Curated annotation (Swiss-Prot):
Part of the 50S ribosomal subunit. In stalled/collided disomes (pairs of ribosomes where the leading ribosome is stalled and a second ribosome has collided with it) bL9 in the collided ribosome contacts bS6 and uL2, while it contacts only helices of the 16S rRNA in the stalled ribosome; the inter-ribosome bridge thus formed is different from that formed between normally translating ribosomes. SUPFAM superfamilies: L9 N-domain-like (SSF55658), Ribosomal protein L9 C-domain (SSF55653). GO terms for molecular function: large ribosomal subunit rRNA binding; structural constituent of ribosome. This is Large ribosomal subunit protein bL9. The keyword Nucleotidyltransferase does not apply. Belongs to the bacterial ribosomal protein bL9 family.
Amino acid sequence: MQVILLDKVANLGSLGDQVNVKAGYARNFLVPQGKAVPATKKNIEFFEARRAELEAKLAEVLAAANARAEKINALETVTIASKAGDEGKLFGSIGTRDIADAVTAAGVEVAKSEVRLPNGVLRTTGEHEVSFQVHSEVFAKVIVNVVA
RNA sequence: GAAGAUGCAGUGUACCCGCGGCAAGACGGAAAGACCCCGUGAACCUUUACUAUAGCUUGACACUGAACAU
Ligand SMILES: [K+]
Ligand SMILES: [K+]
Ligand SMILES: [K+]
Ligand SMILES: [K+]
Ligand SMILES: [Mg+2]
Ligand SMILES: [Mg+2]
Ligand SMILES: [Mg+2]
Ligand SMILES: [Mg+2]
Ligand SMILES: [Mg+2]
Ligand SMILES: [Mg+2]
């Protein structure tokens, strides 16, 4: 399948390219996500005349991602509370939904999809390092404090 | 004598007709022998008979994509 990339897609190419992908890749991911469109005469010529304004829509989104990230980096540490045993080990756990709400209430608004807990959910009291991904290339960070 | 005769030949016996009884024969009545054979007949059953086939199972392609390592 021939498609026209509407953004930077890693391992594929940059905005405006014309690449041959497997049909399933385009059908179930690139096109529904908005990352590409089928390379039909119209699209090709329309995207050719309509290009530099998308290049300005991308840099607007990339900067907006840079601005929200600096705010997340500005919260530094966010404390979360729960119940635990005496050995500090939680009975339940701490996932994305409640880390996101914690950062939301602490100021910066983050969705659960942006949280990236590397070592899974948090199941012990103390301080852990979680990461945030607000853009496909930028990456924020936050120290999370878990107390009983 | 189609080979076990009321009906043919020879011969013997025998007036015509009921009724109560008995079953030796009319190869008695009943059912186009079920046994046996035959038909290039039938059915259902069996199986390492033949040919197929549901099912079960194998791989290729499609629905079906992204990275990295070897
Ligand atoms: K006579
Ligand atoms: K009799
Ligand atoms: K035959
Ligand atoms: K039968
Ligand atoms: Mg005689
Ligand atoms: Mg009498
Ligand atoms: Mg009697
Ligand atoms: Mg008889
Ligand atoms: Mg007969
Ligand atoms: Mg037969």
